[PDB]
Design a binder for this molecule. Structure first.
Ligand SMILES: [Mg+2]
Ligand SMILES: [Mg+2]
Ligand SMILES: [Mg+2]
Ligand SMILES: [Mg+2]
Ligand SMILES: [Mg+2]
Ligand SMILES: [Mg+2]
Ligand SMILES: [Mg+2]
Lengths: 70, 117, 151, 150, 67
RNA sequence: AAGGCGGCCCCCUGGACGAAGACUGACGCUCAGGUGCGAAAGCGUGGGGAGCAAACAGGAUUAGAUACCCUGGUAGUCCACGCCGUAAACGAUGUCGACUUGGAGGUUGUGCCCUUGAGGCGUGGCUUCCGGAGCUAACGCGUUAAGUCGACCGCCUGGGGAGUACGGCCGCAAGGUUAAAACUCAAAUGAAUUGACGGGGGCCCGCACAAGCGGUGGAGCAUGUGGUUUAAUUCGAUGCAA
């Protein structure tokens, strides 16, 4: 991403904008999974393990609204 | 030598080392510095402080050219991705553009196997 | 204490002139329950410093403390046996306390005819940023600001 | 360099506390075999009688029978030359519950053979587990710290 | 949000449209996921094909950097 | 159908689902023997080979490491034509038909109402999570049942021996398939519970750390301890907790 800083802009805010752009692009987070070979078996296992937790959280959110006042 | 008004600083960072190099506008290196040569050995050169030391050494190594308008290009998931840039800024060099071009294979060559540590 | 979080205790108003700063200076300068002679020494030194600097005693003490006032504490929050310290900003109360502790410690460090004379001589240097307090502040600040990549 | 048959198994099998650089006393045909001649230092321990802490377990192969008068005994108890000042540790801290001192290695010191001795004790297969666990755990802690701090 | 294609009754999506299609690509040339766009699974699979057609025909860059 | 399939385009083509219809008229289900497909690995011929990577070499750890950590690295992984029918080929749940409370979704089509906004009511196919009766040894299934029945095939009869040998067939081979007997034992197992353990995790607490402030290891001396000497150096206390 091009983060060419214009005039009258502090280096601090310029670097923060660059870091935010990198974070929203998610380039740094992709190397931690592209650094090694994940077998298709392992990838599918991770995907289902993440899907199971992803609606289990919503299931618990919608189920904890019945009892347990505080 | 012949002084250049504009420059591009490439910061190739990695998990174990960080290299910073300078070119004018086309990819012709002028000065380079590494954390290994910055007085650090082993994993001790992987700290962002070592990256800052390497960046300031590279800035000192390019004093004879006097670059005023610099554009920084980061590459690699290293701790120095911000330390090198801030060191370059603090060394008196003005930054004009900031970019992070990192090689992202589109499901290309197969990476090595998982390490069972 | 993990759960019991207490506040800050109150000290005597230092009825010599009346100042919490002076009371804290006295109760940190005193040792072995010798508050009487500690007060005599510190008051003699401050009265000499008043004429030596031309200003009031309290104002001259406050500005001398401010001129050697530090800003960063270098604590040891390392995760284990590995050496990993951390500098942090200091709250104003602990800042003043540490500054006056450094002053009274330099008083013991530099020797002379009497502790009153040592205190007077060291305050006459902290007035124009000399002695030991400012040197210690600089020596702590250089190593507290040279390590910025470590958070 | 000048190293000869050593017993590194006993280092893992025991807790070496202190070491002695005392020498060994051996007869003919054996010191020559130390150069070449297949000396083996397995099952080595001291056999204190009164002040005579002989090394009992050692098999040095005799390479010749050209002197066919003296009977060859590869399992001979070899005498040991140690200062009486430092021999107090051996008549002292040996017979408490299981303390032993074993021959860790044997080397050369200016054409004279020196056998390194060491005071140690057994592990009962539970100290070995703890040692291996700690050796692995320090490595794992260093690795995880390095990975976390990138 | 809501599927604007269904809201406006857009039956088909053509790669030739760029002004109203740039809204579905990030600044890095990546496709905005459905969980952020608010688009149905019927039209996400057609938006992806249109974006791929535009990338092939140099109408929308694959990424910010190419050379 | 299963195995399994992921930029885009072009050509051929199989299969699946829906409103409203028209049409033959039991043409329907299963199926030993047989036929075909069928992960990867493997084999033969002809190609290619960027990266990865059995075997192999070197380096490192360890008492030892013919391994896990690292640098290289051939077969192979990439293509065409041939051989095997092997997987935890799993949903450990065979194929087809009917019935049995409900809730919250995903995907796909259609009908209607004023569609001003994915406004509202219906209606079929696939699929996901809870959950009632019921079932089960219990975990658990629960309209896609492991609930009640109907039609058929295959398989099971203690754990080892053993899916082994022989025998027949298949295959260039590796091996696959069909499949025992002698001998040993009184056990071999699965679901769940209580403790215990983990180099599993989370939370909490105590001058436990941090923060401070004083001390002990440096030096006279004091009793006390172990060892030594001695006639005895009188008994016990021997990590915190002597
Ligand atoms: Mg293959
Ligand atoms: Mg390898
Ligand atoms: Mg090796
Ligand atoms: Mg099966
Ligand atoms: Mg059939
Ligand atoms: Mg259920
Ligand atoms: Mg067989």
């Amino acid at each position: 991403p091009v983060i060419k800083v214009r005039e009258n802009e502090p280096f601090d805010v310029a670097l923060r904008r660059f870091k935010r752009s990198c974070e929203k692009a998610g380039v740094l987070a992709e190397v931690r999974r592209r650094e090694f070979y994940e077998k298709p078996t392992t990838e599918r296992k991770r995907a289902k393990a993440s899907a199971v937790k992803r609606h289990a959280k919503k299931l618990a959110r919608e189920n904890a609204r019945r009892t347990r006042l505080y | 030598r012949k002084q250049v008004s504009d420059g591009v600083a490439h910061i190739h960072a990695s998990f174990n080392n960080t290299i910073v190099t300078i070119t004018d506008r086309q990819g012709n290196a002028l000065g380079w510095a590494t954390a290994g040569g910055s007085g650090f050995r082993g994993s001790r050169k992987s700290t962002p402080f070592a990256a800052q030391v390497a960046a300031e050494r590279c800035a000192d190594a390019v004093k004879e050219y006097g670059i005023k308008n610099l554009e920084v290009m980061v590459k690699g998931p290293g701790p120095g991705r911000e330390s090198t840039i801030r060191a370059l800024n603090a060394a008196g060099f003005r930054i004009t553009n900031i970019t992070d071009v990192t090689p992202i294979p589109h499901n290309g060559c197969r990476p090595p196997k998982k390490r069972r540590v | 204490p993990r759960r019991r979080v207490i506040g800050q205790r109150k000290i005597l108003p230092d009825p010599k002139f009346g100042s919490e700063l002076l009371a804290k200076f006295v109760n940190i300068l005193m040792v072995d329950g010798k508050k009487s002679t500690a007060e005599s020494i510190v008051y003699s030194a401050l009265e000499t410093l008043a004429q030596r600097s031309g200003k009031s005693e309290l104002e001259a003490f406050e500005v001398a403390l401010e001129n050697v006032r530090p800003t960063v504490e270098v604590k040891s929050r390392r995760v284990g046996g590995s050496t990993y310290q951390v500098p942090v900003e200091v709250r104003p109360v602990r800042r003043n306390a540490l500054a006056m502790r450094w002053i009274v410690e330099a008083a013991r460090k530099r020797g002379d005819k009497s502790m009153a004379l040592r205190l007077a001589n060291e305050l006459s240097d902290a007035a124009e940023n000399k002695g030991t307090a400012v040197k210690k502040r600089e020596d702590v600040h250089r190593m507290a600001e040279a390590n910025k990549a470590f958070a | 360099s000048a190293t000869i048959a050593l017993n590194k198994r006993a280092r893992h099998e025991y807790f070496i506390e202190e070491e002695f650089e005392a020498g060994l006393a051996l007869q003919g045909w054996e010191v020559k075999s130390l150069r070449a001649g297949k000396a083996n230092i397995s099952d080595s321990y001291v056999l204190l009688r009164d002040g005579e802490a002989f090394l009992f377990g050692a098999n040095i192969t005799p390479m010749a029978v050209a002197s066919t008068h003296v009977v060859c005994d590869p399992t001979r108890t070899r005498k040991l030359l140690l200062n009486q000042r430092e021999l107090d540790s051996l008549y002292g801290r040996v017979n408490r519950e299981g303390y032993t001192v074993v021959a860790l290695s044997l080397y050369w010191k200016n054409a004279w053979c020196k056998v390194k001795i060491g005071v140690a004790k057994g592990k009962k297969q539970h100290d070995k587990r703890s040692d291996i666990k700690e050796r692995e755990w320090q490595v794992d802690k260093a690795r995880i710290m390095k990975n976390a701090h990138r | 949000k809501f599927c604007r294609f269904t809201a406006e009754g857009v039956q088909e999506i053509d790669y030739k449209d760029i002004a109203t299609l740039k809204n579905y690509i990030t600044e890095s040339g990546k496709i905005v996921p459905s969980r952020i766009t608010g688009t149905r699974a019927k039209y996400q699979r057609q938006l992806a094909r249109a974006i791929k057609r535009a990338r092939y025909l140099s109408l929308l860059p694959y990424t910010d950097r190419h050379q």
